[PDB]
Amino acid sequence: ELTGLDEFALLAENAEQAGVNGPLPEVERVQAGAISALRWGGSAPRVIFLHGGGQNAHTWDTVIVGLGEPALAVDLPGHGHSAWREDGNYSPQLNSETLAPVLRELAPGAEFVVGMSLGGLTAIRLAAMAPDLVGELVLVDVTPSALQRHAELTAEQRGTVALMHGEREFPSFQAMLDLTIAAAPHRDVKSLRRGVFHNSRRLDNGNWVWRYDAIRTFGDFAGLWDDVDALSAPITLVRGGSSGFVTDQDTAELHRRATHFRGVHIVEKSGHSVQSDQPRALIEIVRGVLD
Ligand SMILES: [Cl-]
């Protein structure tokens, strides 16, 4: 497989996973400085989408194709086509500081922000610092406490990796796909293959690398809870029913601290990446929030 395939070549697969038919929406890549994004359905996005750690904007393709709304799907710093940082600082607080002037230019009229994991917390920091923009937050399988717990578990393996030389280097596409199959073997390989395609690039060596910087570190969660207390945007939470990432105690804590918690939707047979495992169920919920 030699691949100069355009990044929009597989969208018919996304339309089929979403269970929709008809012409594909218009989409193009946009950039303002350090931030790259996919702009869907023209120049007036209704919804902003923020992916998770180790993901990129393309994670949202199926959800965005199924929802049929104009949307902006942003590459977080360190991810997709967005610039890396030497300090490896992809904290919600920093992501939010980079993203806010770009969202003011590229999505000033988008009331709704959907964020998964790191993207969910980035959304909270955005809602805090720039309220005039965020009318409504949807969090996908994340709370501040839930991500703090995940950061603390991986701290030793993010200390060790950091001491290695270069990024990693992969002999083939298949070798990166093999790693993704290992982490989610029950998931349709054509879905997994599409995800790897977007998340990887071939070097002139003929070798392959991930598009994302290996995350050295995350941000100040007490400050992030202070942002949840001050926020006026209503918060909906979406959990994966097979995800242990967010506990019942996590959800109650978010209800207690939020000004307007709209509740948790628990999506049966979804892991952490609800947009990857059950996009049709995520489209219904997001459509519900647009009323
Ligand atoms: Cl994450």
Side-chain angles (χ1 to χ4, degrees), residues 50-60 74-76 78-80 116-117 198-199 211-212 215 272-276:
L50 308 181
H51 65 80
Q55 299 186 335
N56 67 91
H58 279 282
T59 198
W60 298 109
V74 180
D75 290 332
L76 294 187
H79 296 90
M116 187 253 170
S117 211
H198 297 318
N199 214 14
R211 277 193 190 274
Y212 58 85
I215 304 208
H272 184 48
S273 192
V274 183
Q275 73 269 19
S276 316

mmCIF file with all atom_site columns, all heavy atoms in Angstrom, residues 50-60 74-76 78-80 116-117 198-199 211-212 215 272-276:
data_model
loop_
_atom_site.group_PDB
_atom_site.id
_atom_site.type_symbol
_atom_site.label_atom_id
_atom_site.label_alt_id
_atom_site.label_comp_id
_atom_site.label_asym_id
_atom_site.label_entity_id
_atom_site.label_seq_id
_atom_site.pdbx_PDB_ins_code
_atom_site.Cartn_x
_atom_site.Cartn_y
_atom_site.Cartn_z
_atom_site.occupancy
_atom_site.B_iso_or_equiv
_atom_site.pdbx_formal_charge
_atom_site.auth_seq_id
_atom_site.auth_comp_id
_atom_site.auth_asym_id
_atom_site.auth_atom_id
_atom_site.pdbx_PDB_model_num
ATOM 1   N N   . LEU A 1 50  ? -13.698 18.955 20.311 1.00 0.00 ? 50  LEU A N   1
ATOM 2   C CA  . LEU A 1 50  ? -12.316 18.803 20.839 1.00 0.00 ? 50  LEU A CA  1
ATOM 3   C C   . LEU A 1 50  ? -12.088 17.326 21.168 1.00 0.00 ? 50  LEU A C   1
ATOM 4   O O   . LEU A 1 50  ? -12.706 16.830 22.101 1.00 0.00 ? 50  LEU A O   1
ATOM 5   C CB  . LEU A 1 50  ? -12.146 19.726 22.052 1.00 0.00 ? 50  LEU A CB  1
ATOM 6   C CG  . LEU A 1 50  ? -12.540 21.180 21.794 1.00 0.00 ? 50  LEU A CG  1
ATOM 7   C CD1 . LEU A 1 50  ? -12.324 22.052 23.016 1.00 0.00 ? 50  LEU A CD1 1
ATOM 8   C CD2 . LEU A 1 50  ? -11.715 21.764 20.663 1.00 0.00 ? 50  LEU A CD2 1
ATOM 9   N N   . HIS A 1 51  ? -11.221 16.663 20.404 1.00 0.00 ? 51  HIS A N   1
ATOM 10  C CA  . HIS A 1 51  ? -10.817 15.247 20.596 1.00 0.00 ? 51  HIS A CA  1
ATOM 11  C C   . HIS A 1 51  ? -10.054 15.000 21.910 1.00 0.00 ? 51  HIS A C   1
ATOM 12  O O   . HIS A 1 51  ? -9.689  15.980 22.663 1.00 0.00 ? 51  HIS A O   1
ATOM 13  C CB  . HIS A 1 51  ? -9.962  14.811 19.418 1.00 0.00 ? 51  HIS A CB  1
ATOM 14  C CG  . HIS A 1 51  ? -8.660  15.538 19.308 1.00 0.00 ? 51  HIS A CG  1
ATOM 15  N ND1 . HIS A 1 51  ? -7.570  15.198 20.071 1.00 0.00 ? 51  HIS A ND1 1
ATOM 16  C CD2 . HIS A 1 51  ? -8.258  16.546 18.494 1.00 0.00 ? 51  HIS A CD2 1
ATOM 17  C CE1 . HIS A 1 51  ? -6.554  15.958 19.731 1.00 0.00 ? 51  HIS A CE1 1
ATOM 18  N NE2 . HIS A 1 51  ? -6.946  16.793 18.770 1.00 0.00 ? 51  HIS A NE2 1
ATOM 19  N N   . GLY A 1 52  ? -9.720  13.724 22.142 1.00 0.00 ? 52  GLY A N   1
ATOM 20  C CA  . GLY A 1 52  ? -8.952  13.289 23.334 1.00 0.00 ? 52  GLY A CA  1
ATOM 21  C C   . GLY A 1 52  ? -7.432  13.272 23.128 1.00 0.00 ? 52  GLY A C   1
ATOM 22  O O   . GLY A 1 52  ? -6.933  13.500 21.999 1.00 0.00 ? 52  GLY A O   1
ATOM 23  N N   . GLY A 1 53  ? -6.704  12.957 24.199 1.00 0.00 ? 53  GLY A N   1
ATOM 24  C CA  . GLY A 1 53  ? -5.265  12.624 24.147 1.00 0.00 ? 53  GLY A CA  1
ATOM 25  C C   . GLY A 1 53  ? -5.016  11.501 23.171 1.00 0.00 ? 53  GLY A C   1
ATOM 26  O O   . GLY A 1 53  ? -5.797  10.513 23.190 1.00 0.00 ? 53  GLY A O   1
ATOM 27  N N   . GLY A 1 54  ? -3.981  11.651 22.340 1.00 0.00 ? 54  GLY A N   1
ATOM 28  C CA  . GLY A 1 54  ? -3.564  10.665 21.322 1.00 0.00 ? 54  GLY A CA  1
ATOM 29  C C   . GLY A 1 54  ? -4.527  10.575 20.150 1.00 0.00 ? 54  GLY A C   1
ATOM 30  O O   . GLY A 1 54  ? -4.459  9.575  19.414 1.00 0.00 ? 54  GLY A O   1
ATOM 31  N N   . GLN A 1 55  ? -5.434  11.540 20.003 1.00 0.00 ? 55  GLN A N   1
ATOM 32  C CA  . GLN A 1 55  ? -6.424  11.563 18.887 1.00 0.00 ? 55  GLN A CA  1
ATOM 33  C C   . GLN A 1 55  ? -6.152  12.769 17.973 1.00 0.00 ? 55  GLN A C   1
ATOM 34  O O   . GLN A 1 55  ? -5.171  13.518 18.199 1.00 0.00 ? 55  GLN A O   1
ATOM 35  C CB  . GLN A 1 55  ? -7.854  11.569 19.435 1.00 0.00 ? 55  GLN A CB  1
ATOM 36  C CG  . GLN A 1 55  ? -8.209  10.347 20.272 1.00 0.00 ? 55  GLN A CG  1
ATOM 37  C CD  . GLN A 1 55  ? -9.680  10.379 20.646 1.00 0.00 ? 55  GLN A CD  1
ATOM 38  O OE1 . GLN A 1 55  ? -10.325 11.447 20.715 1.00 0.00 ? 55  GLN A OE1 1
ATOM 39  N NE2 . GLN A 1 55  ? -10.231 9.198  20.826 1.00 0.00 ? 55  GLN A NE2 1
ATOM 40  N N   . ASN A 1 56  ? -6.979  12.951 16.954 1.00 0.00 ? 56  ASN A N   1
ATOM 41  C CA  . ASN A 1 56  ? -6.995  14.200 16.145 1.00 0.00 ? 56  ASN A CA  1
ATOM 42  C C   . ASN A 1 56  ? -8.441  14.514 15.764 1.00 0.00 ? 56  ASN A C   1
ATOM 43  O O   . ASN A 1 56  ? -9.368  13.746 16.150 1.00 0.00 ? 56  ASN A O   1
ATOM 44  C CB  . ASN A 1 56  ? -6.068  14.103 14.927 1.00 0.00 ? 56  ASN A CB  1
ATOM 45  C CG  . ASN A 1 56  ? -6.577  13.081 13.935 1.00 0.00 ? 56  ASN A CG  1
ATOM 46  O OD1 . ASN A 1 56  ? -7.345  13.445 13.020 1.00 0.00 ? 56  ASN A OD1 1
ATOM 47  N ND2 . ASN A 1 56  ? -6.179  11.820 14.129 1.00 0.00 ? 56  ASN A ND2 1
ATOM 48  N N   . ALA A 1 57  ? -8.634  15.612 15.047 1.00 0.00 ? 57  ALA A N   1
ATOM 49  C CA  . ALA A 1 57  ? -9.952  16.091 14.593 1.00 0.00 ? 57  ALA A CA  1
ATOM 50  C C   . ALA A 1 57  ? -10.780 14.990 13.894 1.00 0.00 ? 57  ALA A C   1
ATOM 51  O O   . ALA A 1 57  ? -12.007 15.041 13.978 1.00 0.00 ? 57  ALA A O   1
ATOM 52  C CB  . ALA A 1 57  ? -9.734  17.256 13.688 1.00 0.00 ? 57  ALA A CB  1
ATOM 53  N N   . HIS A 1 58  ? -10.132 14.087 13.157 1.00 0.00 ? 58  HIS A N   1
ATOM 54  C CA  . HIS A 1 58  ? -10.820 13.075 12.309 1.00 0.00 ? 58  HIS A CA  1
ATOM 55  C C   . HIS A 1 58  ? -11.602 12.103 13.193 1.00 0.00 ? 58  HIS A C   1
ATOM 56  O O   . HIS A 1 58  ? -12.499 11.430 12.625 1.00 0.00 ? 58  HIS A O   1
ATOM 57  C CB  . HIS A 1 58  ? -9.852  12.313 11.392 1.00 0.00 ? 58  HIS A CB  1
ATOM 58  C CG  . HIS A 1 58  ? -9.483  13.054 10.156 1.00 0.00 ? 58  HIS A CG  1
ATOM 59  N ND1 . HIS A 1 58  ? -10.348 13.124 9.080  1.00 0.00 ? 58  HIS A ND1 1
ATOM 60  C CD2 . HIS A 1 58  ? -8.350  13.715 9.810  1.00 0.00 ? 58  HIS A CD2 1
ATOM 61  C CE1 . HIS A 1 58  ? -9.770  13.803 8.109  1.00 0.00 ? 58  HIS A CE1 1
ATOM 62  N NE2 . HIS A 1 58  ? -8.525  14.170 8.534  1.00 0.00 ? 58  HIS A NE2 1
ATOM 63  N N   . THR A 1 59  ? -11.321 12.045 14.503 1.00 0.00 ? 59  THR A N   1
ATOM 64  C CA  . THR A 1 59  ? -12.070 11.179 15.446 1.00 0.00 ? 59  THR A CA  1
ATOM 65  C C   . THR A 1 59  ? -13.547 11.510 15.299 1.00 0.00 ? 59  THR A C   1
ATOM 66  O O   . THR A 1 59  ? -14.373 10.647 15.579 1.00 0.00 ? 59  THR A O   1
ATOM 67  C CB  . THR A 1 59  ? -11.595 11.333 16.906 1.00 0.00 ? 59  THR A CB  1
ATOM 68  O OG1 . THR A 1 59  ? -12.063 10.202 17.630 1.00 0.00 ? 59  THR A OG1 1
ATOM 69  C CG2 . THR A 1 59  ? -12.068 12.595 17.596 1.00 0.00 ? 59  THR A CG2 1
ATOM 70  N N   . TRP A 1 60  ? -13.870 12.747 14.943 1.00 0.00 ? 60  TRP A N   1
ATOM 71  C CA  . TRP A 1 60  ? -15.277 13.232 14.921 1.00 0.00 ? 60  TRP A CA  1
ATOM 72  C C   . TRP A 1 60  ? -15.952 13.013 13.565 1.00 0.00 ? 60  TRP A C   1
ATOM 73  O O   . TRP A 1 60  ? -17.106 13.385 13.462 1.00 0.00 ? 60  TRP A O   1
ATOM 74  C CB  . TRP A 1 60  ? -15.336 14.702 15.306 1.00 0.00 ? 60  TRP A CB  1
ATOM 75  C CG  . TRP A 1 60  ? -14.853 14.970 16.684 1.00 0.00 ? 60  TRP A CG  1
ATOM 76  C CD1 . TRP A 1 60  ? -13.693 15.601 17.027 1.00 0.00 ? 60  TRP A CD1 1
ATOM 77  C CD2 . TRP A 1 60  ? -15.483 14.597 17.921 1.00 0.00 ? 60  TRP A CD2 1
ATOM 78  N NE1 . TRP A 1 60  ? -13.561 15.654 18.385 1.00 0.00 ? 60  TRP A NE1 1
ATOM 79  C CE2 . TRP A 1 60  ? -14.641 15.055 18.962 1.00 0.00 ? 60  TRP A CE2 1
ATOM 80  C CE3 . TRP A 1 60  ? -16.664 13.935 18.264 1.00 0.00 ? 60  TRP A CE3 1
ATOM 81  C CZ2 . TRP A 1 60  ? -14.952 14.879 20.304 1.00 0.00 ? 60  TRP A CZ2 1
ATOM 82  C CZ3 . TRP A 1 60  ? -16.969 13.766 19.593 1.00 0.00 ? 60  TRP A CZ3 1
ATOM 83  C CH2 . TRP A 1 60  ? -16.140 14.264 20.596 1.00 0.00 ? 60  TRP A CH2 1
ATOM 84  N N   . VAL A 1 74  ? -11.267 20.674 15.956 1.00 0.00 ? 74  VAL A N   1
ATOM 85  C CA  . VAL A 1 74  ? -9.939  21.286 16.161 1.00 0.00 ? 74  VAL A CA  1
ATOM 86  C C   . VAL A 1 74  ? -8.935  20.204 16.491 1.00 0.00 ? 74  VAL A C   1
ATOM 87  O O   . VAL A 1 74  ? -9.306  19.281 17.232 1.00 0.00 ? 74  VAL A O   1
ATOM 88  C CB  . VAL A 1 74  ? -10.031 22.325 17.271 1.00 0.00 ? 74  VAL A CB  1
ATOM 89  C CG1 . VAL A 1 74  ? -8.694  22.952 17.482 1.00 0.00 ? 74  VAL A CG1 1
ATOM 90  C CG2 . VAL A 1 74  ? -11.071 23.384 16.946 1.00 0.00 ? 74  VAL A CG2 1
ATOM 91  N N   . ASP A 1 75  ? -7.730  20.317 15.937 1.00 0.00 ? 75  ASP A N   1
ATOM 92  C CA  . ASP A 1 75  ? -6.537  19.568 16.395 1.00 0.00 ? 75  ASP A CA  1
ATOM 93  C C   . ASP A 1 75  ? -5.997  20.332 17.603 1.00 0.00 ? 75  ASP A C   1
ATOM 94  O O   . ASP A 1 75  ? -5.684  21.528 17.447 1.00 0.00 ? 75  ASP A O   1
ATOM 95  C CB  . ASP A 1 75  ? -5.494  19.392 15.290 1.00 0.00 ? 75  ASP A CB  1
ATOM 96  C CG  . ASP A 1 75  ? -5.880  18.443 14.153 1.00 0.00 ? 75  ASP A CG  1
ATOM 97  O OD1 . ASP A 1 75  ? -6.675  17.502 14.386 1.00 0.00 ? 75  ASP A OD1 1
ATOM 98  O OD2 . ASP A 1 75  ? -5.383  18.645 13.035 1.00 0.00 ? 75  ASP A OD2 1
ATOM 99  N N   . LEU A 1 76  ? -6.055  19.702 18.783 1.00 0.00 ? 76  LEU A N   1
ATOM 100 C CA  . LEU A 1 76  ? -5.385  20.169 20.016 1.00 0.00 ? 76  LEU A CA  1
ATOM 101 C C   . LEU A 1 76  ? -3.900  20.331 19.711 1.00 0.00 ? 76  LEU A C   1
ATOM 102 O O   . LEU A 1 76  ? -3.331  19.556 18.958 1.00 0.00 ? 76  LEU A O   1
ATOM 103 C CB  . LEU A 1 76  ? -5.581  19.171 21.171 1.00 0.00 ? 76  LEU A CB  1
ATOM 104 C CG  . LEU A 1 76  ? -7.007  19.003 21.693 1.00 0.00 ? 76  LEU A CG  1
ATOM 105 C CD1 . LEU A 1 76  ? -7.003  18.125 22.929 1.00 0.00 ? 76  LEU A CD1 1
ATOM 106 C CD2 . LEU A 1 76  ? -7.670  20.352 21.958 1.00 0.00 ? 76  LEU A CD2 1
ATOM 107 N N   . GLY A 1 78  ? -0.138  19.626 19.904 1.00 0.00 ? 78  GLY A N   1
ATOM 108 C CA  . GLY A 1 78  ? 0.531   18.326 20.021 1.00 0.00 ? 78  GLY A CA  1
ATOM 109 C C   . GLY A 1 78  ? -0.125  17.240 19.203 1.00 0.00 ? 78  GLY A C   1
ATOM 110 O O   . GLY A 1 78  ? 0.347   16.105 19.317 1.00 0.00 ? 78  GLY A O   1
ATOM 111 N N   . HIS A 1 79  ? -1.181  17.549 18.439 1.00 0.00 ? 79  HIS A N   1
ATOM 112 C CA  . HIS A 1 79  ? -2.082  16.549 17.783 1.00 0.00 ? 79  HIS A CA  1
ATOM 113 C C   . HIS A 1 79  ? -2.450  16.965 16.340 1.00 0.00 ? 79  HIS A C   1
ATOM 114 O O   . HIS A 1 79  ? -2.472  18.167 16.035 1.00 0.00 ? 79  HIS A O   1
ATOM 115 C CB  . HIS A 1 79  ? -3.337  16.388 18.634 1.00 0.00 ? 79  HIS A CB  1
ATOM 116 C CG  . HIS A 1 79  ? -3.063  15.819 19.988 1.00 0.00 ? 79  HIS A CG  1
ATOM 117 N ND1 . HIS A 1 79  ? -2.773  16.617 21.072 1.00 0.00 ? 79  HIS A ND1 1
ATOM 118 C CD2 . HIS A 1 79  ? -3.041  14.533 20.424 1.00 0.00 ? 79  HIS A CD2 1
ATOM 119 C CE1 . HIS A 1 79  ? -2.545  15.845 22.124 1.00 0.00 ? 79  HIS A CE1 1
ATOM 120 N NE2 . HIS A 1 79  ? -2.723  14.566 21.757 1.00 0.00 ? 79  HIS A NE2 1
ATOM 121 N N   . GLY A 1 80  ? -2.756  15.986 15.499 1.00 0.00 ? 80  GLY A N   1
ATOM 122 C CA  . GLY A 1 80  ? -3.146  16.178 14.088 1.00 0.00 ? 80  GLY A CA  1
ATOM 123 C C   . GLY A 1 80  ? -2.106  17.000 13.352 1.00 0.00 ? 80  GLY A C   1
ATOM 124 O O   . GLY A 1 80  ? -0.951  16.560 13.315 1.00 0.00 ? 80  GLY A O   1
ATOM 125 N N   . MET A 1 116 ? -14.086 15.402 24.298 1.00 0.00 ? 116 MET A N   1
ATOM 126 C CA  . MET A 1 116 ? -13.774 14.070 24.841 1.00 0.00 ? 116 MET A CA  1
ATOM 127 C C   . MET A 1 116 ? -12.438 14.119 25.592 1.00 0.00 ? 116 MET A C   1
ATOM 128 O O   . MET A 1 116 ? -11.440 14.691 25.064 1.00 0.00 ? 116 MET A O   1
ATOM 129 C CB  . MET A 1 116 ? -13.727 13.057 23.699 1.00 0.00 ? 116 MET A CB  1
ATOM 130 C CG  . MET A 1 116 ? -13.570 11.639 24.171 1.00 0.00 ? 116 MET A CG  1
ATOM 131 S SD  . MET A 1 116 ? -11.900 11.133 23.811 1.00 0.00 ? 116 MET A SD  1
ATOM 132 C CE  . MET A 1 116 ? -11.843 9.578  24.700 1.00 0.00 ? 116 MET A CE  1
ATOM 133 N N   . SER A 1 117 ? -12.409 13.501 26.776 1.00 0.00 ? 117 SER A N   1
ATOM 134 C CA  . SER A 1 117 ? -11.208 13.460 27.664 1.00 0.00 ? 117 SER A CA  1
ATOM 135 C C   . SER A 1 117 ? -10.460 14.806 27.763 1.00 0.00 ? 117 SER A C   1
ATOM 136 O O   . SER A 1 117 ? -11.048 15.753 28.257 1.00 0.00 ? 117 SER A O   1
ATOM 137 C CB  . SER A 1 117 ? -10.331 12.254 27.442 1.00 0.00 ? 117 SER A CB  1
ATOM 138 O OG  . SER A 1 117 ? -9.686  11.863 28.638 1.00 0.00 ? 117 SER A OG  1
ATOM 139 N N   . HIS A 1 198 ? -5.537  8.455  9.651  1.00 0.00 ? 198 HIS A N   1
ATOM 140 C CA  . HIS A 1 198 ? -5.599  9.881  10.088 1.00 0.00 ? 198 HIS A CA  1
ATOM 141 C C   . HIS A 1 198 ? -4.550  10.220 11.162 1.00 0.00 ? 198 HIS A C   1
ATOM 142 O O   . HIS A 1 198 ? -4.154  11.391 11.253 1.00 0.00 ? 198 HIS A O   1
ATOM 143 C CB  . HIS A 1 198 ? -7.017  10.218 10.556 1.00 0.00 ? 198 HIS A CB  1
ATOM 144 C CG  . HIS A 1 198 ? -8.020  10.087 9.462  1.00 0.00 ? 198 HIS A CG  1
ATOM 145 N ND1 . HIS A 1 198 ? -7.764  10.536 8.185  1.00 0.00 ? 198 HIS A ND1 1
ATOM 146 C CD2 . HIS A 1 198 ? -9.262  9.553  9.445  1.00 0.00 ? 198 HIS A CD2 1
ATOM 147 C CE1 . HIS A 1 198 ? -8.827  10.323 7.431  1.00 0.00 ? 198 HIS A CE1 1
ATOM 148 N NE2 . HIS A 1 198 ? -9.780  9.727  8.181  1.00 0.00 ? 198 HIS A NE2 1
ATOM 149 N N   . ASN A 1 199 ? -4.124  9.252  11.971 1.00 0.00 ? 199 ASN A N   1
ATOM 150 C CA  . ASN A 1 199 ? -3.373  9.535  13.221 1.00 0.00 ? 199 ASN A CA  1
ATOM 151 C C   . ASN A 1 199 ? -1.877  9.321  12.964 1.00 0.00 ? 199 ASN A C   1
ATOM 152 O O   . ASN A 1 199 ? -1.066  9.517  13.899 1.00 0.00 ? 199 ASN A O   1
ATOM 153 C CB  . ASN A 1 199 ? -3.919  8.713  14.381 1.00 0.00 ? 199 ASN A CB  1
ATOM 154 C CG  . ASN A 1 199 ? -3.842  9.443  15.703 1.00 0.00 ? 199 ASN A CG  1
ATOM 155 O OD1 . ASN A 1 199 ? -3.618  10.663 15.728 1.00 0.00 ? 199 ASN A OD1 1
ATOM 156 N ND2 . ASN A 1 199 ? -4.029  8.724  16.810 1.00 0.00 ? 199 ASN A ND2 1
ATOM 157 N N   . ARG A 1 211 ? 1.051   11.060 14.480 1.00 0.00 ? 211 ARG A N   1
ATOM 158 C CA  . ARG A 1 211 ? 0.926   12.517 14.256 1.00 0.00 ? 211 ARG A CA  1
ATOM 159 C C   . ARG A 1 211 ? 1.025   13.250 15.596 1.00 0.00 ? 211 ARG A C   1
ATOM 160 O O   . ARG A 1 211 ? 1.388   14.456 15.577 1.00 0.00 ? 211 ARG A O   1
ATOM 161 C CB  . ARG A 1 211 ? -0.382  12.856 13.542 1.00 0.00 ? 211 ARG A CB  1
ATOM 162 C CG  . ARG A 1 211 ? -0.315  12.685 12.037 1.00 0.00 ? 211 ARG A CG  1
ATOM 163 C CD  . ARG A 1 211 ? -1.490  13.314 11.322 1.00 0.00 ? 211 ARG A CD  1
ATOM 164 N NE  . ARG A 1 211 ? -1.441  12.891 9.943  1.00 0.00 ? 211 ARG A NE  1
ATOM 165 C CZ  . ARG A 1 211 ? -0.734  13.503 8.997  1.00 0.00 ? 211 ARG A CZ  1
ATOM 166 N NH1 . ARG A 1 211 ? -0.031  14.587 9.280  1.00 0.00 ? 211 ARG A NH1 1
ATOM 167 N NH2 . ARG A 1 211 ? -0.734  13.024 7.773  1.00 0.00 ? 211 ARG A NH2 1
ATOM 168 N N   . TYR A 1 212 ? 0.707   12.574 16.707 1.00 0.00 ? 212 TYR A N   1
ATOM 169 C CA  . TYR A 1 212 ? 0.620   13.208 18.048 1.00 0.00 ? 212 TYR A CA  1
ATOM 170 C C   . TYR A 1 212 ? 1.984   13.102 18.745 1.00 0.00 ? 212 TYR A C   1
ATOM 171 O O   . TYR A 1 212 ? 2.713   12.128 18.592 1.00 0.00 ? 212 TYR A O   1
ATOM 172 C CB  . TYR A 1 212 ? -0.487  12.588 18.918 1.00 0.00 ? 212 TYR A CB  1
ATOM 173 C CG  . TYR A 1 212 ? -0.374  11.100 19.178 1.00 0.00 ? 212 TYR A CG  1
ATOM 174 C CD1 . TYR A 1 212 ? 0.407   10.580 20.206 1.00 0.00 ? 212 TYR A CD1 1
ATOM 175 C CD2 . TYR A 1 212 ? -1.052  10.206 18.376 1.00 0.00 ? 212 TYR A CD2 1
ATOM 176 C CE1 . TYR A 1 212 ? 0.494   9.205  20.429 1.00 0.00 ? 212 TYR A CE1 1
ATOM 177 C CE2 . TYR A 1 212 ? -0.981  8.837  18.577 1.00 0.00 ? 212 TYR A CE2 1
ATOM 178 C CZ  . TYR A 1 212 ? -0.217  8.332  19.618 1.00 0.00 ? 212 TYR A CZ  1
ATOM 179 O OH  . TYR A 1 212 ? -0.188  6.974  19.764 1.00 0.00 ? 212 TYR A OH  1
ATOM 180 N N   . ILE A 1 215 ? 2.512   12.548 25.049 1.00 0.00 ? 215 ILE A N   1
ATOM 181 C CA  . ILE A 1 215 ? 2.195   13.527 26.130 1.00 0.00 ? 215 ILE A CA  1
ATOM 182 C C   . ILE A 1 215 ? 3.082   13.331 27.362 1.00 0.00 ? 215 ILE A C   1
ATOM 183 O O   . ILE A 1 215 ? 2.894   12.323 28.050 1.00 0.00 ? 215 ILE A O   1
ATOM 184 C CB  . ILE A 1 215 ? 0.695   13.485 26.486 1.00 0.00 ? 215 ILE A CB  1
ATOM 185 C CG1 . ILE A 1 215 ? -0.182  13.734 25.258 1.00 0.00 ? 215 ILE A CG1 1
ATOM 186 C CG2 . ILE A 1 215 ? 0.367   14.468 27.598 1.00 0.00 ? 215 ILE A CG2 1
ATOM 187 C CD1 . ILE A 1 215 ? -1.521  14.352 25.581 1.00 0.00 ? 215 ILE A CD1 1
ATOM 188 N N   . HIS A 1 272 ? -14.267 4.296  26.346 1.00 0.00 ? 272 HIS A N   1
ATOM 189 C CA  . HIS A 1 272 ? -13.906 5.695  26.664 1.00 0.00 ? 272 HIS A CA  1
ATOM 190 C C   . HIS A 1 272 ? -14.211 6.547  25.432 1.00 0.00 ? 272 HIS A C   1
ATOM 191 O O   . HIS A 1 272 ? -14.838 7.592  25.599 1.00 0.00 ? 272 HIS A O   1
ATOM 192 C CB  . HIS A 1 272 ? -12.436 5.711  27.127 1.00 0.00 ? 272 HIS A CB  1
ATOM 193 C CG  . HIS A 1 272 ? -11.938 7.044  27.582 1.00 0.00 ? 272 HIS A CG  1
ATOM 194 N ND1 . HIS A 1 272 ? -12.636 7.842  28.466 1.00 0.00 ? 272 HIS A ND1 1
ATOM 195 C CD2 . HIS A 1 272 ? -10.784 7.701  27.311 1.00 0.00 ? 272 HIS A CD2 1
ATOM 196 C CE1 . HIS A 1 272 ? -11.963 8.966  28.679 1.00 0.00 ? 272 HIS A CE1 1
ATOM 197 N NE2 . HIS A 1 272 ? -10.814 8.898  27.981 1.00 0.00 ? 272 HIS A NE2 1
ATOM 198 N N   . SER A 1 273 ? -13.825 6.080  24.240 1.00 0.00 ? 273 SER A N   1
ATOM 199 C CA  . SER A 1 273 ? -13.971 6.869  22.986 1.00 0.00 ? 273 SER A CA  1
ATOM 200 C C   . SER A 1 273 ? -15.349 6.607  22.380 1.00 0.00 ? 273 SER A C   1
ATOM 201 O O   . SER A 1 273 ? -15.458 5.817  21.409 1.00 0.00 ? 273 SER A O   1
ATOM 202 C CB  . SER A 1 273 ? -12.833 6.641  22.024 1.00 0.00 ? 273 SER A CB  1
ATOM 203 O OG  . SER A 1 273 ? -12.902 7.628  21.010 1.00 0.00 ? 273 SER A OG  1
ATOM 204 N N   . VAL A 1 274 ? -16.374 7.216  22.991 1.00 0.00 ? 274 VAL A N   1
ATOM 205 C CA  . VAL A 1 274 ? -17.802 7.037  22.599 1.00 0.00 ? 274 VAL A CA  1
ATOM 206 C C   . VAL A 1 274 ? -17.961 7.380  21.102 1.00 0.00 ? 274 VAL A C   1
ATOM 207 O O   . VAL A 1 274 ? -18.703 6.635  20.389 1.00 0.00 ? 274 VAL A O   1
ATOM 208 C CB  . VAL A 1 274 ? -18.739 7.870  23.495 1.00 0.00 ? 274 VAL A CB  1
ATOM 209 C CG1 . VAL A 1 274 ? -20.184 7.625  23.124 1.00 0.00 ? 274 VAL A CG1 1
ATOM 210 C CG2 . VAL A 1 274 ? -18.528 7.607  24.985 1.00 0.00 ? 274 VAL A CG2 1
ATOM 211 N N   . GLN A 1 275 ? -17.301 8.444  20.618 1.00 0.00 ? 275 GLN A N   1
ATOM 212 C CA  . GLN A 1 275 ? -17.376 8.870  19.192 1.00 0.00 ? 275 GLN A CA  1
ATOM 213 C C   . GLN A 1 275 ? -16.820 7.782  18.258 1.00 0.00 ? 275 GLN A C   1
ATOM 214 O O   . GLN A 1 275 ? -17.210 7.794  17.060 1.00 0.00 ? 275 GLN A O   1
ATOM 215 C CB  . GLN A 1 275 ? -16.675 10.213 18.986 1.00 0.00 ? 275 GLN A CB  1
ATOM 216 C CG  . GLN A 1 275 ? -15.159 10.156 19.037 1.00 0.00 ? 275 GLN A CG  1
ATOM 217 C CD  . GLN A 1 275 ? -14.630 10.388 20.428 1.00 0.00 ? 275 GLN A CD  1
ATOM 218 O OE1 . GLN A 1 275 ? -15.367 10.257 21.421 1.00 0.00 ? 275 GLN A OE1 1
ATOM 219 N NE2 . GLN A 1 275 ? -13.351 10.769 20.502 1.00 0.00 ? 275 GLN A NE2 1
ATOM 220 N N   . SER A 1 276 ? -15.937 6.907  18.743 1.00 0.00 ? 276 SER A N   1
ATOM 221 C CA  . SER A 1 276 ? -15.361 5.769  17.984 1.00 0.00 ? 276 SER A CA  1
ATOM 222 C C   . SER A 1 276 ? -16.231 4.513  18.139 1.00 0.00 ? 276 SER A C   1
ATOM 223 O O   . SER A 1 276 ? -16.375 3.794  17.162 1.00 0.00 ? 276 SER A O   1
ATOM 224 C CB  . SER A 1 276 ? -13.946 5.468  18.402 1.00 0.00 ? 276 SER A CB  1
ATOM 225 O OG  . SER A 1 276 ? -13.189 6.672  18.543 1.00 0.00 ? 276 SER A OG  1
#
